[PDB]
């Protein structure tokens with residue numbers, strides 16, 4: 001039977017990019033897909049245009065399209081959900097205002113997931129602020145659990161890979177064990193202190209190839225500021241690269257990661273995590289995923305004082321956003 | 332060794348869609364690609380942003396990116412060229428109205444291809460009016476030949492398949508031998524008089540499943556107006572579906588068509604084509620492509636009176652567009 005995949009904000013730049021890749025088989029391969037596309041009413045005219053284009057692609061893997069502005073219809077029997085839709089950042093809008101505006105959206109979508117989606121639904125939150133939006137959706141999804149939710153830091157992760165590969169002058173598939181800790185924000189911790197690069201014989205630690213000043217300074221600022229830089233250049237969002245990251249995240253989450261491969265995923269903090277992060281937020285960790293689709297935090301990593309401090313700062317921000325989010329929802 | 336692929340208008344809607352698909356391996360598979368991306372100076376800021384996004388995808392198949400506003404740099408030693416760069420129509424006009432704004436581009440790019448690209452370069456013209464822009468480019472490429480050039484009707488073709496599949500109520504891969512003849516314009520001839528459809532109980536002719544009046548009326552107008560319909564709905568270009576069609580066209584052109592499949596391609600009209608079209612324009616024909624990448628017009632097709640009249644009408648339009656284009660170029664040349 002076909003798999004039911006939801007994309008919210010489907011008429012937007014990320015939704016658009018994601019829809020055609022999923023429709024043509026990039027996510028589930030040969031398995032047929034029924035795309036659920038959710039928009040708000042003012043975007044429905046454009047969304048029907050997207051549906052026309054999908055038909056005009058003649059992709060055999062696309063078994064059906066459900067375009068709607070009704071959450072009950074959008075979330076019904078969904079197996080996979082990309083929560084991309086969110087209020088647009090107008091000129092001059094601050095992060096704090098965006099948090100408040102989106103809080104209500106993810107409360108509604110959390111409830112809709114709980115009541116309408118399959119109990120096994122895998123929910124990836126892309127819309128910003130991703131970690132906190134994910135927290136809100138999960139908080140309002142009583143029929144679901146922590147295993148159903150994650151927030152996307154995979155674009156931060158892919159950015160780190162691309163940049164370190166270029167710095168080292170190696171192809172991207174020769175870089176391993178990169179990590180982005182914490183929040184999808186400027187307090188994210190791009191951490192290559194565990195990363196390795198393939199040489200002729202075996203591997204080489206990235207920290208042995210490059211100086212500390214770069215790895216903990218310039219590199220960090222480069223990745224943390226990359227989203228703003230793309231926006232500045234294009235005068236638009238990082239659509240294709242974000243859609244790509246979302247697919248990579250979901251693919252690894254659904255089918256598992258290869259041995260040795262780490263992927264950064266914002267996940268509910270378990271009390272047993274070995275890095276001292278307190279439960280109660282969505283926090284990006286280095287993860288593996290087994291063939292059952294179960295996420296496992298990578299253990300046994302030595303955290304230096306610099307990484308430790310950065311990890312603490314981003315946790316503190318995540319806690320702040322939560323409290324800010326809970327207060328606005330309380331009304 | 333990596334293949335060098337040019338996309339012009341790379342910061343724009345179709346160019347952006349096409350770039351990531353090519354970069355990730357959708358066109359050449361596991362073979363490495365170096366992308367050449369050409370824009371005009373005002374769009375270079377955005378193009379560097381696209382280049383950032385490409386790096387941020389971490390695709391192993393992408394061996395390099397050359398982003399520039401210099402045609403000499405952009406066209407240098409290119410193997411494959413998607414000429415997308417061009418003004419789109421908006422919100423609702425004729426593709427021939429773009430002729431004035433776009434004709435000069437293809438004159439320059441034709442010369443650049445001839446002088447800088449590999450003599451074996453495969454050039455797909457997407458920018459509108461596609462058939463006439465392709466003619467202009469070829470006319471200005473003295474080193475190259477008809478084999479180097481085509482114009483995209485593959486989106487018309489894919490629309491026709493999607494729509495007839497939906498109407499027939501079958502999956503899209505169950506429809507075969509669709510044709511779109513002529514100009515990528517309102518006079519295009521979506522022709523399913525040769526098409527077949529596979530069902531549980533066997534293969535049948537589309538003409539036996541649907542009435543002639545639908546096939547020559549409602550269906551035709553739907554496909555002919557589809558480009559404008561999408562533009563009206565989205566308030567933007569048919570970016571992803573056009574990029575998809577461009578990739579389909581180029582893939583089939585480079586690697587050949589699967590046995591039994593026809594694809595519609597705008598190509599230079601050869602002397603002694605089977606269907607009476609006069610040489611001197613770029614005309615969409617039903618084509619197969621062999622493993623050598625050589626295009627062949629499908630022969631022996633029975634052309635009914637309705638299709639014949641439509642084919643003549645679209646040829647007439649292409650000839651008119653050619654003469655308009657040459658007049659426009661002569662005017663521009665002399666201010």
Ligand SMILES: NC(=O)C1=CN([C@@H]2O[C@H](COP(=O)(O)OP(=O)(O)OC[C@H]3O[C@@H](n4cnc5c(N)ncnc54)[C@H](O)[C@@H]3O)[C@@H](O)[C@H]2O)C=CC1
Nearest residue numbers: 009011012013014039043085086126127128152155237242
């Ligand atoms: N986690 C990450 O790495 C990244 C996150 N983003 C975030 O993704 C989000 C979307 O970005 P774009 O696609 O560029 O924005 P966009 O503005 O182009 O599209 C957003 C779409 O969401 C729709 N929408 C608004 N409220 C909705 C609701 N309640 N339900 C369903 N749909 C709704 C809008 O109609 C719009 O079409 C933004 O919040 C952005 O900050 C963007 C890039 C990377």
Ligand SMILES: NC(=O)C1=CN([C@@H]2O[C@H](COP(=O)(O)OP(=O)(O)OC[C@H]3O[C@@H](n4cnc5c(N)ncnc54)[C@H](O)[C@@H]3O)[C@@H](O)[C@H]2O)C=CC1
Nearest residue numbers: 340343344345370374416417418419458459483486568573
């Ligand atoms: N054949 C077909 O089936 C289709 C054709 N089209 C056509 O494709 C063309 C592009 O459409 P969009 O990408 O939506 O337009 P767009 O406006 O989003 O992008 C066009 C890009 O071309 C660039 N450009 C202009 N002159 C140039 C030059 N001399 N060299 C390099 N780049 C140049 C612009 O800077 C711009 O970024 C249009 O002419 C449109 O009509 C669109 C859809 C389907």
